mmCIF file of C-alpha atoms in Angstrom:
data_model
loop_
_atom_site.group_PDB
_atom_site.id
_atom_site.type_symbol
_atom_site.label_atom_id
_atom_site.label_comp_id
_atom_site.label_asym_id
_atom_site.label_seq_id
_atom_site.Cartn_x
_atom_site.Cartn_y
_atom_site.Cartn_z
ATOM 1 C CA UNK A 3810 185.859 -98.472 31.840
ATOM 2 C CA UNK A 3811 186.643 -94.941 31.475
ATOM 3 C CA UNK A 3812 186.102 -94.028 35.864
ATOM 4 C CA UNK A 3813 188.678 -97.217 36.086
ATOM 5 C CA UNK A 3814 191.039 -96.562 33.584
ATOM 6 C CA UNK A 3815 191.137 -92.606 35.359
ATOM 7 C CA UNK A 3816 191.706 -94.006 38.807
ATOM 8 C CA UNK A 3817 194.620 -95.933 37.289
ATOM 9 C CA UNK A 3818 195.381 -92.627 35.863
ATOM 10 C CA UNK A 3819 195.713 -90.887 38.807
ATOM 11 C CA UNK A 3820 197.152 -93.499 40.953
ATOM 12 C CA UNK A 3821 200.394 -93.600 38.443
ATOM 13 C CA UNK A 3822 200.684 -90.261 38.071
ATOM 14 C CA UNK A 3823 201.022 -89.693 41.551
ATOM 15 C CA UNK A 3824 203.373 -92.729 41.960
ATOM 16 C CA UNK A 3825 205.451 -91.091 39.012
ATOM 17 C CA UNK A 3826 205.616 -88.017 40.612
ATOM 18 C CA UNK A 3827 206.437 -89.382 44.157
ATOM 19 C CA UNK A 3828 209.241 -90.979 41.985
ATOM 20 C CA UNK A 3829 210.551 -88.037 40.099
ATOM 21 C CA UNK A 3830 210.522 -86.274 43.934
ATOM 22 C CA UNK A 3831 212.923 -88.483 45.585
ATOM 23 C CA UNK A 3832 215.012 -88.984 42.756
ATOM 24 C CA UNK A 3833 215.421 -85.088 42.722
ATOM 25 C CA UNK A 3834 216.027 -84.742 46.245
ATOM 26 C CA UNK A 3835 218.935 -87.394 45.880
ATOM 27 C CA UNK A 3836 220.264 -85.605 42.839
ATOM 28 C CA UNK A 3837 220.432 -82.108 44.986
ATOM 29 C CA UNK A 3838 221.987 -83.621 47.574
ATOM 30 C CA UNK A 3839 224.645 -85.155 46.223
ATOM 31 C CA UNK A 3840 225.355 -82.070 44.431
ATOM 32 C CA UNK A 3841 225.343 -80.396 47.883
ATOM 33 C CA UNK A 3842 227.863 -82.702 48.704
ATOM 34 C CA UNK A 3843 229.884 -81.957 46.580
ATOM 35 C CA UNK A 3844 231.610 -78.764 47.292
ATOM 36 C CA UNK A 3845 233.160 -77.769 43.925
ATOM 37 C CA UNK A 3846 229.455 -77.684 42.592
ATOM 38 C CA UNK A 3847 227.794 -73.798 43.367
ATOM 39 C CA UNK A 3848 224.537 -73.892 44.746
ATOM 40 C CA UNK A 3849 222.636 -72.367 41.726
ATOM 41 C CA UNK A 3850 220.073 -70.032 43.423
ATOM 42 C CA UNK A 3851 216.852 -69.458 41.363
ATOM 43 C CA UNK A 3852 214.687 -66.861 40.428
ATOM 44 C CA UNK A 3853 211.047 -67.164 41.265
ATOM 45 C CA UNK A 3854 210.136 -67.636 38.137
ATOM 46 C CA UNK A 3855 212.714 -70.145 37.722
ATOM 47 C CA UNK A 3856 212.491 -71.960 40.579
ATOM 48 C CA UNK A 3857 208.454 -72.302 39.893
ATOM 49 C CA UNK A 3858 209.373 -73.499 36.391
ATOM 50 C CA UNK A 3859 211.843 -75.971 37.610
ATOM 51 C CA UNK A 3860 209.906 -76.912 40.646
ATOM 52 C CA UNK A 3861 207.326 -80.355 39.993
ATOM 53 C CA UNK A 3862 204.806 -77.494 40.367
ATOM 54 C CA UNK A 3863 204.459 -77.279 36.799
ATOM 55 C CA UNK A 3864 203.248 -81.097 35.668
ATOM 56 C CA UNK A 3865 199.439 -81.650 35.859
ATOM 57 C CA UNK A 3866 197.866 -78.440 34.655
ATOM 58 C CA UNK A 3867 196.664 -79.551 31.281
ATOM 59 C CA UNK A 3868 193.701 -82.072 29.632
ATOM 60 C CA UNK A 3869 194.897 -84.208 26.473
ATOM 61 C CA UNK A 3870 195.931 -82.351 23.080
ATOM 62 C CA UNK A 3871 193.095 -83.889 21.181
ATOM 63 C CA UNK A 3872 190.283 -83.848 24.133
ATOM 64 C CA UNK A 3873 187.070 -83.121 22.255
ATOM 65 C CA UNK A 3874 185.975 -81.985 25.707
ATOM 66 C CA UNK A 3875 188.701 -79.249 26.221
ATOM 67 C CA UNK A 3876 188.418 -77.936 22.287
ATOM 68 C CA UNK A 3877 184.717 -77.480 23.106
ATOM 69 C CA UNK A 3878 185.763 -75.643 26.607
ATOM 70 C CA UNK A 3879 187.931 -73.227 24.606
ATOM 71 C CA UNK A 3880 185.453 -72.811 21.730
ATOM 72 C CA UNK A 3881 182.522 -72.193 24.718
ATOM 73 C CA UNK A 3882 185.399 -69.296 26.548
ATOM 74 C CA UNK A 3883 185.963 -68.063 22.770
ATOM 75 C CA UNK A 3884 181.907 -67.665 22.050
ATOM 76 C CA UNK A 3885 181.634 -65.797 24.912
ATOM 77 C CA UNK A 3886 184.808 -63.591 24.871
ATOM 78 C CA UNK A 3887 183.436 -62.704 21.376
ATOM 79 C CA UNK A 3888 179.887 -61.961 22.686
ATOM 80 C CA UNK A 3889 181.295 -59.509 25.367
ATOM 81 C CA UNK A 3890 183.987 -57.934 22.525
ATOM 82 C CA UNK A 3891 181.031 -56.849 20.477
ATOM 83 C CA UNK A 3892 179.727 -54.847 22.452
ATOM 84 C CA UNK A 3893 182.091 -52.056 20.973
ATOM 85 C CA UNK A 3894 180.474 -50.788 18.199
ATOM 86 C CA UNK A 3895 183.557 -50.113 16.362
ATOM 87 C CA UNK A 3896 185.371 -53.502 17.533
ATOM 88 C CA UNK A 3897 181.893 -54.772 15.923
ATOM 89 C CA UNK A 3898 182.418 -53.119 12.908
ATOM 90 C CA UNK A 3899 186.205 -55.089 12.698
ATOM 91 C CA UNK A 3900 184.830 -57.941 13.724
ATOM 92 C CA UNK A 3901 182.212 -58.081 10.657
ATOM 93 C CA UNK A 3902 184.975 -57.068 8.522
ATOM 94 C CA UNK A 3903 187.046 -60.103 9.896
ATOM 95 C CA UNK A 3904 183.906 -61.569 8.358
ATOM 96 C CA UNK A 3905 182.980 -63.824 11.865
ATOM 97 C CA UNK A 3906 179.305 -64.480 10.946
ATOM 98 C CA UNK A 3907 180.132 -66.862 8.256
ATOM 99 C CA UNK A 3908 182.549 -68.869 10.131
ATOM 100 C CA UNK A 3909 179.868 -68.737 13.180
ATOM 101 C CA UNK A 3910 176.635 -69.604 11.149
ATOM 102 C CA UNK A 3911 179.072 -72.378 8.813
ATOM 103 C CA UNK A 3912 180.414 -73.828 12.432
ATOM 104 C CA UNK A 3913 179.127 -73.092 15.750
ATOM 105 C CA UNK A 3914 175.436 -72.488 14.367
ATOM 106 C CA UNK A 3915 174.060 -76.073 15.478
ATOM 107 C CA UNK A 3916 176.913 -78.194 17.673
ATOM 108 C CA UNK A 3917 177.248 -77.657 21.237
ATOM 109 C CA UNK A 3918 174.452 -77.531 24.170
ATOM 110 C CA UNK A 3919 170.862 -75.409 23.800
ATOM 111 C CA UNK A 3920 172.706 -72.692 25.938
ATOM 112 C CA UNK A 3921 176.088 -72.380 24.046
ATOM 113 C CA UNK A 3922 172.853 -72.367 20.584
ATOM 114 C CA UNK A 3923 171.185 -69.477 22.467
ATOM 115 C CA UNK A 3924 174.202 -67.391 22.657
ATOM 116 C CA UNK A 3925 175.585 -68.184 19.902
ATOM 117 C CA UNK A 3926 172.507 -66.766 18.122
ATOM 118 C CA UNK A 3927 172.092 -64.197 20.163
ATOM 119 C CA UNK A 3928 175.501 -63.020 19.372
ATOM 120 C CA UNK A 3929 174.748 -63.855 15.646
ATOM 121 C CA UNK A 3930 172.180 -61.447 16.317
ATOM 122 C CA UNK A 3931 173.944 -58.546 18.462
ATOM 123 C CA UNK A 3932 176.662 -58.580 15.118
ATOM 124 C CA UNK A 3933 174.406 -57.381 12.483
ATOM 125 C CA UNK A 3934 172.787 -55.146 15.250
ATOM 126 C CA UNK A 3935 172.969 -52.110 12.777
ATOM 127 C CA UNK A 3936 175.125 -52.915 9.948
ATOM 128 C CA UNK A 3937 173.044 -53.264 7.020
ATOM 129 C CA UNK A 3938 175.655 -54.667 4.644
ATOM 130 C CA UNK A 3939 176.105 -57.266 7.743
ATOM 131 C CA UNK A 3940 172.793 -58.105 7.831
ATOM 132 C CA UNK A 3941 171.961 -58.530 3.783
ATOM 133 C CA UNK A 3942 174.801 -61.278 4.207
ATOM 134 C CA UNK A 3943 173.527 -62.858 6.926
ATOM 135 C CA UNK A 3944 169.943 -62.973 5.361
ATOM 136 C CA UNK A 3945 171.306 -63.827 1.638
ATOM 137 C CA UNK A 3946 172.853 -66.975 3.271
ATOM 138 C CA UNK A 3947 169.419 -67.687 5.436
ATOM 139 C CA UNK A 3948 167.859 -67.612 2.222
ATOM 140 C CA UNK A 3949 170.017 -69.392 0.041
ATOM 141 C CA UNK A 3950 170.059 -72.167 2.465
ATOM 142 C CA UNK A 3951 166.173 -72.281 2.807
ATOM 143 C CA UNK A 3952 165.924 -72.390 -0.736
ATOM 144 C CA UNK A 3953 168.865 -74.863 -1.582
ATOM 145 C CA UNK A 3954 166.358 -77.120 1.274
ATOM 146 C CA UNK A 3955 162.858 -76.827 -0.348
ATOM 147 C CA UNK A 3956 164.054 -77.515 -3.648
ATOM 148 C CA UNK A 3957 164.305 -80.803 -2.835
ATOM 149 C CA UNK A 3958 161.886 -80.726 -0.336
ATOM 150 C CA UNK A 3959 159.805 -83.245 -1.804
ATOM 151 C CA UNK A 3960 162.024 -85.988 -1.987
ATOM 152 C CA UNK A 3961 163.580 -85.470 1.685
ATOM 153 C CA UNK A 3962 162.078 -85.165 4.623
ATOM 154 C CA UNK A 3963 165.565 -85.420 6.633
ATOM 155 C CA UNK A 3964 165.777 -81.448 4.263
ATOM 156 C CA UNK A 3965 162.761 -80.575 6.324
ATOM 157 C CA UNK A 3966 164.388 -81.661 9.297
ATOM 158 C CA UNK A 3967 167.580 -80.208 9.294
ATOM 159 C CA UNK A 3968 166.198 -76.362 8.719
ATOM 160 C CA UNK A 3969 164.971 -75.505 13.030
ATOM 161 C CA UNK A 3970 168.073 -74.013 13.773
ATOM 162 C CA UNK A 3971 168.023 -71.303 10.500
ATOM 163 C CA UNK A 3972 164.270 -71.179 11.607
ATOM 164 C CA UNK A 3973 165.155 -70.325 15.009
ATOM 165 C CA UNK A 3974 168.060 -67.624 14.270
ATOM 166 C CA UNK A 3975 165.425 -65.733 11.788
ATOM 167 C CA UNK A 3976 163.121 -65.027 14.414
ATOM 168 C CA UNK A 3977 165.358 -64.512 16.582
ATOM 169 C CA UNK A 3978 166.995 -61.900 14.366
ATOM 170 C CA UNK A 3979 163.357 -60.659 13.754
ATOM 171 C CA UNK A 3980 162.719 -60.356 17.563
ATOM 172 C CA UNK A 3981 165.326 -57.613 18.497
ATOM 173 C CA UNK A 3982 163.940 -54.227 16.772
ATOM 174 C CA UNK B 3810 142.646 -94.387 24.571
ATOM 175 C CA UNK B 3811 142.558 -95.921 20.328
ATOM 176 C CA UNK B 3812 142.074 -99.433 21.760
ATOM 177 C CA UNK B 3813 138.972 -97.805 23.817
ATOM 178 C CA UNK B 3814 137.798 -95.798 20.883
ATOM 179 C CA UNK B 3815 138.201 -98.951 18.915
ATOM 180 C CA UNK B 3816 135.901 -101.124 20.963
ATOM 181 C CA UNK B 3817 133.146 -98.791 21.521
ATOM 182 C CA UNK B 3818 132.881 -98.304 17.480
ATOM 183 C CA UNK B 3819 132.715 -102.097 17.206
ATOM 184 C CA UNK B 3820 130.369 -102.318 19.703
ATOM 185 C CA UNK B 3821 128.123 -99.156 17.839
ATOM 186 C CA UNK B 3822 128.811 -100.961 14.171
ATOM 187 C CA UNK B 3823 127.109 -104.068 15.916
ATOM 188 C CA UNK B 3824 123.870 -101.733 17.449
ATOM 189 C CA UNK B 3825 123.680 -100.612 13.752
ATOM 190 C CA UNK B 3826 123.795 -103.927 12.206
ATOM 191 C CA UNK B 3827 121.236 -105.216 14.694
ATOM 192 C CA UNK B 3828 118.694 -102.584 14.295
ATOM 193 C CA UNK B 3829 119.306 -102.499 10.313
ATOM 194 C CA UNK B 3830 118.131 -105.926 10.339
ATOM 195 C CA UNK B 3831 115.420 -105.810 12.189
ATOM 196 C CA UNK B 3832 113.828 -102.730 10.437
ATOM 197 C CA UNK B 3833 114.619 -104.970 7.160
ATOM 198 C CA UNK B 3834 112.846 -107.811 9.242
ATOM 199 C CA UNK B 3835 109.723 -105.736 9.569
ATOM 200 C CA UNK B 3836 109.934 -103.841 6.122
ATOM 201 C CA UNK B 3854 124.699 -111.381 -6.404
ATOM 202 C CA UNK B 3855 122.018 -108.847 -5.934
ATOM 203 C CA UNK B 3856 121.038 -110.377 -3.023
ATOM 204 C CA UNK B 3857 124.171 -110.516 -1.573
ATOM 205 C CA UNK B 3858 124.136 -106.717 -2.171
ATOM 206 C CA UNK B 3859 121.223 -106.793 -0.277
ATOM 207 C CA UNK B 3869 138.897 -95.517 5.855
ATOM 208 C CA UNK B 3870 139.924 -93.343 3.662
ATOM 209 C CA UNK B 3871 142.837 -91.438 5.098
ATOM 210 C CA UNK B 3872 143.947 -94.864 6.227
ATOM 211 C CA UNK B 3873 147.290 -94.917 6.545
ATOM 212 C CA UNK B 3874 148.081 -98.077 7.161
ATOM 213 C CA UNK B 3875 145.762 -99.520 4.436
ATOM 214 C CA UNK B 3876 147.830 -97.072 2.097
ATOM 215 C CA UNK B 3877 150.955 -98.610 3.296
ATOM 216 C CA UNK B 3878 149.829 -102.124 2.524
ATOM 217 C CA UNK B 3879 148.386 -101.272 -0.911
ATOM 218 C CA UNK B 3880 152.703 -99.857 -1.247
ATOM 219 C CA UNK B 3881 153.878 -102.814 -0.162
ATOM 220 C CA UNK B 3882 151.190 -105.316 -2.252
ATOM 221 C CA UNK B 3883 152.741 -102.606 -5.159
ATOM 222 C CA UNK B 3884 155.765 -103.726 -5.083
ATOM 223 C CA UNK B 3885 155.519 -107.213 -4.485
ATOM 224 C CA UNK B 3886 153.438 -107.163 -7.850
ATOM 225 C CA UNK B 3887 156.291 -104.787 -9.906
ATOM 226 C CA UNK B 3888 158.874 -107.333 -8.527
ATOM 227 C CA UNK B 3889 156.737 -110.047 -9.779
ATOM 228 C CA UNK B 3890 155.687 -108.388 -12.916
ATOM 229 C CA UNK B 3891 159.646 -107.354 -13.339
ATOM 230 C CA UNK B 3892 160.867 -110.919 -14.783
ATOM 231 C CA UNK B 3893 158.925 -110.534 -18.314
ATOM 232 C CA UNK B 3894 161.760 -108.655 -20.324
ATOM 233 C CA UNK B 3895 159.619 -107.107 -22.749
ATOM 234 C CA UNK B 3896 157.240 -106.146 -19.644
ATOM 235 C CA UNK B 3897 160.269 -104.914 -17.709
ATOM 236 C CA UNK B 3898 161.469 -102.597 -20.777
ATOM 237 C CA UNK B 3899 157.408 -101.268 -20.688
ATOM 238 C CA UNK B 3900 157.862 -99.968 -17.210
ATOM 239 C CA UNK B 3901 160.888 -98.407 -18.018
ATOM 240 C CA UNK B 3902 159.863 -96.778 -20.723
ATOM 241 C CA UNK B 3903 157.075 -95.839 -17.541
ATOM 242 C CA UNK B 3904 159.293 -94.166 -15.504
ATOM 243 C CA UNK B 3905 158.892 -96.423 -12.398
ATOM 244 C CA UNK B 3906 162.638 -96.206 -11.877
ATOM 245 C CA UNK B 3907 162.253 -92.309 -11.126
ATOM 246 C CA UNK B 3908 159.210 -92.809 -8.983
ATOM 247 C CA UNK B 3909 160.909 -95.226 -6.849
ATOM 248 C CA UNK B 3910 163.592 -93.658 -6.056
ATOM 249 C CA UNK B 3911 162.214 -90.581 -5.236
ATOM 250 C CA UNK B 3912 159.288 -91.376 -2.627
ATOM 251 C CA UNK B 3913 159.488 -95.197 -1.785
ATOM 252 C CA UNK B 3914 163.070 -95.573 -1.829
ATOM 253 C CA UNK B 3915 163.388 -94.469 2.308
ATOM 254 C CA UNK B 3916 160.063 -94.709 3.255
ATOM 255 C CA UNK B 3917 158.725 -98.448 4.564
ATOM 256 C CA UNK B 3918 159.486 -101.106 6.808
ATOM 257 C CA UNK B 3919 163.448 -102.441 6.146
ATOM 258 C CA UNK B 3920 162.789 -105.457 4.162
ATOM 259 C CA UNK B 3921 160.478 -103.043 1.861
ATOM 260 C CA UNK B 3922 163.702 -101.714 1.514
ATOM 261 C CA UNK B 3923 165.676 -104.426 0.695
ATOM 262 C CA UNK B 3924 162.576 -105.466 -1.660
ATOM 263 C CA UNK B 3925 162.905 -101.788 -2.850
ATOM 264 C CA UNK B 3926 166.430 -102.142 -3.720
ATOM 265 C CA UNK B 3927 166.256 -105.534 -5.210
ATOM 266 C CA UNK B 3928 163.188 -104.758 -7.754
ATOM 267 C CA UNK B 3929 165.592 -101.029 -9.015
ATOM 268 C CA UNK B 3930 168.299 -104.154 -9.091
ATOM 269 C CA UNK B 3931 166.549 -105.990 -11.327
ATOM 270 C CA UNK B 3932 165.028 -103.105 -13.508
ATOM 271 C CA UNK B 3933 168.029 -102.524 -14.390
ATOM 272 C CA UNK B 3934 168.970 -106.223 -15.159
ATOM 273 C CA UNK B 3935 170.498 -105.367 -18.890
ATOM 274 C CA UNK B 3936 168.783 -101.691 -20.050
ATOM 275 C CA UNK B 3937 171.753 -100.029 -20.413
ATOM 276 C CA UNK B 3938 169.881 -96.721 -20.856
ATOM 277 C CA UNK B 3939 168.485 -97.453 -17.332
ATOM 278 C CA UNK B 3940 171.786 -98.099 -15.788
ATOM 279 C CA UNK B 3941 172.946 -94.514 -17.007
ATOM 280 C CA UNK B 3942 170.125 -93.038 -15.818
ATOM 281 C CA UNK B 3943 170.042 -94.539 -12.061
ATOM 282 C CA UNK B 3944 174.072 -94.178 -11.996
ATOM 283 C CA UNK B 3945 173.158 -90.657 -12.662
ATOM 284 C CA UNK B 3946 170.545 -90.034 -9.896
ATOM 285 C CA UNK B 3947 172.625 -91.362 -7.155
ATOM 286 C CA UNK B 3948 175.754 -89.744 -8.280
ATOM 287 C CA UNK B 3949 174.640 -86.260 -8.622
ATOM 288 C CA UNK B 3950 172.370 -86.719 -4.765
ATOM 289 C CA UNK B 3951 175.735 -87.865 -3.491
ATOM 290 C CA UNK B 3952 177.399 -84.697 -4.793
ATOM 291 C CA UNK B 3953 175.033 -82.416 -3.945
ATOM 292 C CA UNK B 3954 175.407 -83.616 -0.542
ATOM 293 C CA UNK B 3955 178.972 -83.804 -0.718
ATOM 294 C CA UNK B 3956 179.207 -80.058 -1.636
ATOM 295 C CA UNK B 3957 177.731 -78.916 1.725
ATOM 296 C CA UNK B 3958 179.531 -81.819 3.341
ATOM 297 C CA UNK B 3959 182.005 -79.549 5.373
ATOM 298 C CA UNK B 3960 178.692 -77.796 6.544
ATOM 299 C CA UNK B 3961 176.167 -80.416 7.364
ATOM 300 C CA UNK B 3962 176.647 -83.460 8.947
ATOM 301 C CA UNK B 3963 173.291 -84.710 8.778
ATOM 302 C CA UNK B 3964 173.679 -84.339 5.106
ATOM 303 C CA UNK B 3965 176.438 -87.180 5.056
ATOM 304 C CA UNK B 3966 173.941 -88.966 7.524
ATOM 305 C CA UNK B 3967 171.514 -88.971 4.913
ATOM 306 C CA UNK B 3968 173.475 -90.841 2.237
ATOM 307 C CA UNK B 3969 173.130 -94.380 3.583
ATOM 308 C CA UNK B 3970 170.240 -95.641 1.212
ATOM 309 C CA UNK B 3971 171.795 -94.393 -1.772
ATOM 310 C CA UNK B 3972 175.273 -96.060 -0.903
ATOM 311 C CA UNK B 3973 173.622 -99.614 -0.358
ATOM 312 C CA UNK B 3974 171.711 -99.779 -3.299
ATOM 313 C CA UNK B 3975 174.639 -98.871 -5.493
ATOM 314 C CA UNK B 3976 176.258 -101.755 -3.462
ATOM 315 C CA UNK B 3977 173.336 -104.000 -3.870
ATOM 316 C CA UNK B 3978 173.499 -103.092 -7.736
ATOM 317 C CA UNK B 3979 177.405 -104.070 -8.169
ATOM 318 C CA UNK B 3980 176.762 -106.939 -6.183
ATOM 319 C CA UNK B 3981 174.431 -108.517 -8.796
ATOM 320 C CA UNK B 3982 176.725 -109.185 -11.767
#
């Protein structure tokens, strides 16, 4: 349903557009015609903005897909900004790492995981206020799980991912 | 590779037998004469509950197994666990624990409200912890549904 509904897509969108083109070309002739009407010249920047250039170079507002493009261009935009020690330092003081472990800690593919914990990682590289956080809310989730650890086993379940970030945090000296 | 395993010790249970008797041969009371059995464990659960349900319709017996505990017990390990008509058995004996005990009512009203908020405080952070709320939700259905 979805490959057939996007070839209708496509196949009106390009019918639209053929539209819109002819329709224009009428309009700027007839004010050619007419004499009393200037030519308006454009600037390049104009004439790109006016031109039917500008009209299929975006997915839906609500695409799940394109949010999780930008959040996948943000992760790693943020994993090559901390490399600065000092833009680290803002970063951590922008307090990032709880958004990251609250958010982006389990969703996305087992790549965009990796690098999102390796860049969990790479943020509390040396900052050791950084890093008590980050282990006080390992913990405190842990904890929170095993206390009613005997009741659920979906509470054992749902703990790889903290697992995985703690020796992963362990693993770089 | 069980169904293998399971046919050779049948076949070495009969070898036993066979030799057994024939030592006997040459050698109530004559009638005399697993474990970690998981499944066995299961069915002695389920032959549980059918009994409790049973047992259940005595009042005076049903305010004796309150005064047990059972409610707690259930609800903690055999509430999720089991086949799905154990659960529907499951939440049709708590049902009918709690046909009139007041006391009781409290008390299970209690337990499911305070596992729903304590998943509903992480609720932003987990999904799987709103995943995990679907037991609790029908029985509290299944318990308004029985006036």
């Amino acid at each position: 349903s979805f490959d057939e509904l996007s070839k209708i897509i496509q196949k009106v969108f390009a019918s639209r557009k053929e539209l819109l083109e002819y329709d224009l070309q009428q309009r700027e002739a007839a004010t050619k015609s007419s004499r009393t009407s200037v030519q308006p010249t454009f600037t390049a920047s104009q004439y790109r903005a006016l031109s039917v250039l500008g009209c299929g170079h975006t997915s839906s507002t609500k695409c799940y897909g394109c949010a999780s493009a930008v959040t996948e261009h943000c992760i790693t935009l943020l994993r090559a900004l901390a490399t600065n020690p000092a833009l680290r330092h803002i970063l951590v003081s922008q307090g990032l790492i709880r958004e990251l472990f609250d958010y982006n800690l389990r969703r996305g593919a087992a790549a965009m995981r990796e690098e999102v914990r390796q860049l969990m990682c790479l943020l509390t590289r040396d900052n050791p206020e950084a890093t008590q956080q980050m282990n006080d809310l390992i913990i405190g989730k842990v904890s929170t799980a095993l206390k009613g650890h005997w009741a659920n086993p979906d509470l054992a379940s749902s703990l790889q991912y903290e697992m995985l970030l703690l020796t992963d945090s362990i693993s770089k000296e």
